[PDB]
Amino acid sequence: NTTDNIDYFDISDESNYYLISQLRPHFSNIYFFDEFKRYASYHTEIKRYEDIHKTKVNSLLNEASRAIGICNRAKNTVKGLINILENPQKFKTQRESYDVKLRQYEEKKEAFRGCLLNKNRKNLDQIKKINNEIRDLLEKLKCSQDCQTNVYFDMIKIYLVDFKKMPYENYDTFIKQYKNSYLSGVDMIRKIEKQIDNPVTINAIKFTQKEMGYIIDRFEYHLQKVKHSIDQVTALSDGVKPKQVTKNRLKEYYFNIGNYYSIFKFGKDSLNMLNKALIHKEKIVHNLLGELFGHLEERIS
Amino acid sequence: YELTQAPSVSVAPGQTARITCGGDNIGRTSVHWYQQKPGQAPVLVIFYDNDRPSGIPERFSGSNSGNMATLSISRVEVGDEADYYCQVWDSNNDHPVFGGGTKLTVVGQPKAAPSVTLFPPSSEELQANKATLVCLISDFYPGAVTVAWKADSSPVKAGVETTTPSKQSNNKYAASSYLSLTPEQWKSHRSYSCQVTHEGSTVEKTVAP
Amino acid sequence: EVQLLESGGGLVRPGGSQRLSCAASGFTFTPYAMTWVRQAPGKGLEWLSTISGSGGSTSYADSVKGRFTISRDNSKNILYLQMDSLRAEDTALYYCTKDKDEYTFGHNAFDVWGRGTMVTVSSASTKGPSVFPLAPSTAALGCLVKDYFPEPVTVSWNSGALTSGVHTFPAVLQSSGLYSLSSVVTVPSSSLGTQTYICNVNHKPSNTKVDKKVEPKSC
């Protein structure tokens, strides 16, 4: 059919350190800033809640949100070319070759994803400047040589039940089933493809399949990251539990579980979205395979 | 999944070589073929049963059907001598798998007789209470020689180590044989001889102290 | 233009560890699945491990599963293979290779290959060679490179000035576990009294350079 939503594309900086998603808050680091919002909620000697949230965190979210919107024009240009290359009936209403329309898709796609990074470069530098402010805000803790780890382990236990809400095993079952169907569908198109008849339906299948592989590749990335941070903090839930540490150690404690938890929430957003994107692509491939096998009396490939 | 390949295939120049790749219903999956010449990396020569990479000669063709896949090289040249590997995706264990490989040997090349050089033990070596006899065999085709050592006129079995024949730059082969002796053994005898047998003919060299 | 270059293999004790790397260049490295394939001396190709483009999925062969680990750095275009608990049977030439297309997870042909890196797992210690001159009786003179471990050995003549007529034979693997080769050079006997001949033997693993003058035999 038609891909009505191309939210599955992402991009990262050249250092591969910051990952931009089209879903809010576009950066996992924003989820970590919200966790410090909850970390200071339990440390009563910190009343800088309004300063970090209103003056910094929420305005970075809006600037990233605005930067994503600047690329909406390039976003729809890419979708328009996807709907032509995946749809033989639509491709037949236009006049240019399949290789010509295919090259435009490659150019427009790189222009779109590149827009997601270029418009967000100044927002990414703001992330490192905020990271330092949470360390400074945690330095205002009244304690120093002995800092209770009560809140740090209270947050860990709350994180364990938040992980239960996510269906990891079914997500694992899902990606293994569709990846297996994807590979066998790709290998079969290799064998059945020929060049004596009109190759427009084989072309649309291969095009959709290549996007299927990209979605599968991204799904496995997030599923692995989610599993990592889950196993890590449950290990900390079973890992050594001092009733007190020095304020420098408690700072990296909050930064450890805060990073782990923010990757979880970021993965949950992306995995729920990539799940629908892959399902929609698979249904298009099967609609295309029906066209390929719909006129057995005439020809196939 | 397992892929069955014959260890060796022999063809004459200008003929059509055929290298088989066997497997239960291998025709359901794509078969890829790799050529590996000695001391070199594998080169993808046929992919997806019969697709040919740009730059590979048309003499390379492929077929995959039923339980047998076949890579066929037509008008075989001597330069086609290599090891050929097939590969498929193992759909039960979800990973690639390679066949055992097949060595192609192009027959009918001109026969070349080996050249033999024999060096006596070094004088600096004998000062260190050791003695080595060096027998160097060069420029011979085919690559199959047997080496026999002799003290005076008696065969020597102990202390002999011989290399496997290796194809040189010029499609001929080279091998070396080393006889280890004590300095007393070397100065004891009248002579020592390295005899090289190649396709029925012999070349013999001899040194003495 | 598309290049793969393996590195990091050398001598290592049984039970030890060693990290191999593959530097990729000339293409978009991230969307491709990368694969390690080893080849024991004189044996065939053996698939070891494959990793997805993003690293979300990894697979291993039973022969190395639990001991090897594949990984990649998509910001520097480098593929890694961390080998722990190395055994003698891990002695092989380790190849880097790449899927022909993107997002195929190893279910594809391998179009570009590196030239491999030699991993030698053994408990024998690195030993430098002893070099002896093979005096001539056209003539034939040479140098014997005796008892060294491991490979390789490089032999030049007259500090590289002499190059025509030189034949350096493949090394023999002795029952002792040490290697030995001979480098022979054919010169006209016009030169035995005029030109001089010195072999230059270099063994990088033991950091030993030796020169031996090859003079005729005289009484």
For chain A, the distance separating the N- and C-terminal CA atoms, rounded to the nearest angstrom, is: 20
CA distances from A21 to A72, A120, A280, C153, C171 (A): 14, 11, 19, 54, 58
Domains of chain C: 3-121 (2.60.40.10), 130-213 (2.60.40.10)
CB within 8 Å: C56 and A222: yes
CA distance C92 to C37: 10
CB B163 within 8 A of CB B132: no
Mutation for A interface: B91, B92, B95, most A CBs within 10 A: B91
Torsion, Cα of A18, A20, A24, A29 (10° steps): 0
User: So where are chain A's domains?
Assistant: 1-297
CB within 8 Å: C50 and B89: no
Whose CA is closest to A191, among B51, C91, C155? Answer: B51
Using the 8-state DSSP alphabet, how is residue C26 labeled?
A: S
CA distances from A77 to A69, A106, A112 (A): 14, 12, 9
Task: Give me the residues paired with residue C59 across strands.
Answer: C50
Whose CA is closest to B32, among B66, B60, B7? Answer: B60
CATH superfamily, domain at B115-207: Immunoglobulins (2.60.40.10)
CB within 8 Å: B124 and C184: no
Characterize the bridge pairing of strands B8-11 and B102-106: parallel
- Give the containing element (helix H, strand E) for C111: strand C110-113
Whose CA is closest to C86, among C63, C106, C108? Answer: C63
Using CB atoms, pick whichever of C106, C114, C171 lies closest to residue B96.
C106
Whose CA is closest to A257, among A38, A64, A93, A88? Answer: A38
| Chain C residues within 8 Å of chain A (Cβ atoms) | 31, 52-57, 73-75, 102-105, 107
* Min distance B50 CA to chain A CA atoms (Å): 9
User: So where are chain B's domains?
Assistant: 4-106, 115-207
CB within 8 Å: A191 and B48: yes
* Min distance B29 CA to chain A CA atoms (Å): 7
Using CB atoms, pick whichever of B30, B89, B94 lies closest to residue A191.
B30
Rg over CA atoms, chain C:
22
3-state SS, residue C95: strand
Whose CA is closest to C34, among C60, C64, C72? Answer: C72
ω into C150 cis (within 30 of 0) = yes
Tokens at residue B82, please?
A: 């290599």
- B48 at interface of A, judged by CB pairs closer than 8 A: yes
* Domain with residues B4-106, CATH architecture: Sandwich (2.60)
CA distances from B65 to B98, B102, B109 (A): 18, 19, 34
Using CB atoms, pick whichever of C73, C74, C102 lies closest to residue A213.
C102
The residue of chain B with its CA nearest to that of C62 is B93
Half-sphere exposure in the Cβ direction for C101 (13 Å, CA):
17
3-state SS, residue C113: strand
CB within 8 Å: C56 and A224: yes
Sheet holding B192-198, edge to edge: B154-156, B146-151, B192-198, B201-207
Helix/strand/coil (H/E/C) assignment for every residue in C115-167:
CCEEEEECCCCCECCEEEEECCCCEEEEEEEEEEECCCCEEEEHHHCECCCEE
CA distance A215 to C165: 60
Q: Which amino acid is at B1?
A: Y
* Min distance A197 CA to chain B CA atoms (Å): 18
Using the 8-state DSSP alphabet, how is residue C191 labeled?
A: S
Phi and psi torsions of C115, nearest 5° = -95, 0
The angle formed by the CA atoms of residues C150, C153 and C157, to the nearest 5 degrees, is 165
Helix/strand/coil (H/E/C) assignment for every residue in chain A:
CCCCCCCCCEEECCCCCCEEECCCCCCHHHHHHHHHHHHHHHCCCCCCHHHHHHHHHHHHHHHHHHHHHHCHHHHHHHHHHHHHHCCHHHHCCCCCCHHHHHHHHHHHHHHHHHHHHHCCHHHHHHHHHHHHHHHHHHHCCCCCCCEECHHHHHHHHHHHHHHHCCCHHHHHHHHHHHHHHHHHHHHHHHHHCCCCCCCHHHHHHHHHHHHHHHHHHHHHHHHHHHHHHHHHHHHHHHCCCCCEECHHHHHHHHHHHHHHHHHHHHHHHHHHHHHHHHHHHHHHHHHHHHHHCCCCCCCCC
